[PDB]
């Protein structure tokens, strides 16, 4: 059960370096690069592909991933985006009468 | 990836492999190289994601002005 | 079907998957699939140099192995 | 009748890749490599040992200060020329599946060179005769000159070696500093490593 | 081996068969191989298949109309 | 405020505006080829973690 500690260790020190790495940057810059969803894109969905086995190898097959529409979010938006907290202006409806609004679903 | 990378592993392996190893191990190398060159554009200074934060002028973001109306009723 | 191909969630499932197929295997006497499995399985070196020695059919290294991992 | 085929399937597949890899067979295209389909047996067509002359590689055996005169170093020897060793494409990978590559593929191959290693049964004698026709073949065709009768004993013997060792290696080795099979697995590794298995024919399909 | 059941089956048969099989020794698995009669599904009729229209399901099944013949 | 600041800013926003293509475009392929590999974090990490 070592291993265990060992990999939260493994992730206490990712988190810790991340959080010195954004106090670094941050501080008179606007950095993007840890920011996940920031520079959002509207990735194509391609039915070429079948086999689906390590997305990210297979340069030429991910290469039929065309990105389209490419935008940026207000921080908050973003921040919004993590966790399940639903997106600012979202209307659900349901059975003529509102309901509480409801996340985003999550695709793989 | 990088606090125990596979490519170590691999060679000492004791068990039989598969292509979906190698397969692994050459994606976290792709990981491990474009952070690298991610890192190296940054340190370069000729990241278009990072840049200096600007001024905000505090006059403007509190009162409406006549022309902004206007430019509202345009619209 | 449920041995392999599981989430890393699934840890304890799978391993009493592997358990119960092992079972099997000895049951049936087919020890060479039943090797192959704890020896896929297995995590100490110890334990995967000494059954693929009792699988060769050598036993006097095997016993030895499991002499230094005991 | 899926996994009583699946087990006949591997073990038939170890005994063809040991007997390929022996004689350093190449060009193993998946159109000569017939599979039953009521047993697992398997058995490949056009069984020739590929030779290439010693100037053509970079074998040393000829430099264990064989009585050959060194006018003559262009004498055959068996060699794979093909990157990976023996075939092994991820298909049959897919197929064997995860736990049958440890428990079948590399213990039969284990098993099948164990055996057939100077335990009362040493090919020092028996591989003698079929390389010397080997060799006289290769001369005849080739090279297309008579080999004298020294030259022709020495040539015999140095290849007769060679074979003999490629056999050995894969014996586990008396001590147990590791896991037996480890050659294998050795072997097992470079055949299944993409590096590898790209830099090959097309006409050899490794996709399939 | 068919031969070989428990007391609901017949007695006598079933004791000299093992009688027969044990006398044998050695020689009575030394043909023990690897199978070679397996059927495919092609063989063993089966594969034959028939478009059917099920109440709970919304559209058409394709059943197997072969597993009696 | 400061005045110096922004002038390093502008100029600094001046002088990315001016690389050339090639550049540029390998900035562009750098960030697609993140999001990429960001898409799929989760079944390479449970991989790995088998693995």
Redesign the interface.
């Known amino acids: 059960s070592t291993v265990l500690n060992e990999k939260d260790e493994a992730i206490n020190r990712a988190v810790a370096e991340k959080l010195r790495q954004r106090k670094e940057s941050d501080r008179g810059w606007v950095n993007l690069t840890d920011d996940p969803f920031n520079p959002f894109l509207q990735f194509t969905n391609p039915d070429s592909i079948l086999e689906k086995g390590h997305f990210p190898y297979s340069s030429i097959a991910a290469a039929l991933f065309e990105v389209d529409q490419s935008n940026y979010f207000d921080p908050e938006i973003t921040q919004l985006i993590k966790d399940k907290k639903p997106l600012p202006r979202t209307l659900c409806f349901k059975d003529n009468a509102l309901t509480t609004p409801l996340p985003p679903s999550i695709y793989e | 990836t990088q606090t125990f990378p596979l490519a170590k592993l691999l060679p000492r392996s004791?068990?039989?492999l598969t292509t979906d190893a190698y397969e692994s191990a050459l994606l976290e190398g792709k990981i491990a190289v474009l952070y690298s060159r991610i890192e190296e554009l940054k340190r370069q200074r000729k990241w278009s994601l990072r840049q200096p934060k600007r001024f905000i002028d505090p006059f403007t973001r509190e009162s409406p002005t006549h022309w902004d109306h206007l430019l509202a009723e345009m619209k | 079907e449920l041995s392999?191909g599981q989430?890393?969630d699934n840890q304890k499932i799978s391993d009493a998957n592997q358990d119960a197929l092992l079972e099997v295997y000895m049951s049936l006497q087919?020890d060479?699939?039943?090797?192959?499995?704890w020896?896929?399985r297995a995590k100490y070196?110890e334990t995967?140099?000494a059954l693929?020695?009792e699988?060769?059919?050598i036993w006097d290294?095997a016993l030895?192995?499991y002499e230094a991992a005991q | 009748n899926y996994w009583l085929f699946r087990?006949q399937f591997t073990a038939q597949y170890a005994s063809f890749i040991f007997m390929t890899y022996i004689m350093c067979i190449n060009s193993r295209q998946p159109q000569k490599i017939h599979i039953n389909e009521g047993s697992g047996n398997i058995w490949t067509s056009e069984m020739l040992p590929t030779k290439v002359a010693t100037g053509k590689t970079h074998s040393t055996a000829y430099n264990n200060s064989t009585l050959d005169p060194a006018v003559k170093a262009g004498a055959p020897i068996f060699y794979n020329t093909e990157s990976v060793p023996f075939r092994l494409t991820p298909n049959i990978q897919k197929f064997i599946?995860?736990?049958?590559?440890?428990?079948?593929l590399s213990?039969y191959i284990?098993?099948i060179a164990?055996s057939l290693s100077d335990s009362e049964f040493d090919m020092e004698q028996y591989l003698s005769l079929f390389v010397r026709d080997e060799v006289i073949s290769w001369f005849a065709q080739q090279h297309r000159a008579s080999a004298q009768t020294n030259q022709l004993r020495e040539i015999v013997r140095v290849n007769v070696e060679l074979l003999t060792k490629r056999v050995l290696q894969l014996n586990?080795i008396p001590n147990?500093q590791?896991?037996?099979?480890q050659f294998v697995l050795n072997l097992i590794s470079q055949a299944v490593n993409p590096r590898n298995l790209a830099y090959t024919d097309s006409a050899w399909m490794a996709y399939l | 081996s068919k031969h070989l059941k428990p007391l609901p089956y017949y007695h006598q048969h079933s004791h000299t068969t093992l009688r027969i099989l044990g006398k044998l020794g050695g020689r009575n698995r030394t043909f023990i191989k690897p199978v070679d009669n397996l059927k495919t599904d092609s063989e063993l009729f089966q594969n034959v298949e028939a478009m059917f229209k099920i109440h709970g399901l919304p559209n058409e099944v394709p059943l197997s109309i072969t597993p009696g013949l | 405020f400061d005045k110096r600041r922004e002038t390093e800013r502008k100029q600094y926003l001046r002088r990315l505006l001016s690389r050339s293509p090639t550049e540029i475009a390998e900035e562009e392929s750098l960030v697609i080829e993140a999001r990429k590999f960001e898409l799929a974090a989760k079944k390479m990490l449970?991989e790995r973690?088998?693995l």
């Open positions: 004791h068990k039989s | 392999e989430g890393i087919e060479d699939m039943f090797y192959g499995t020896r896929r070196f995967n140099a693929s020695y699988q060769i059919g290294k030895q192995l | 087990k599946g995860e736990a049958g590559l440890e428990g079948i213990v284990l098993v164990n586990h147990s590791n896991v037996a099979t | 449970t973690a088998s």
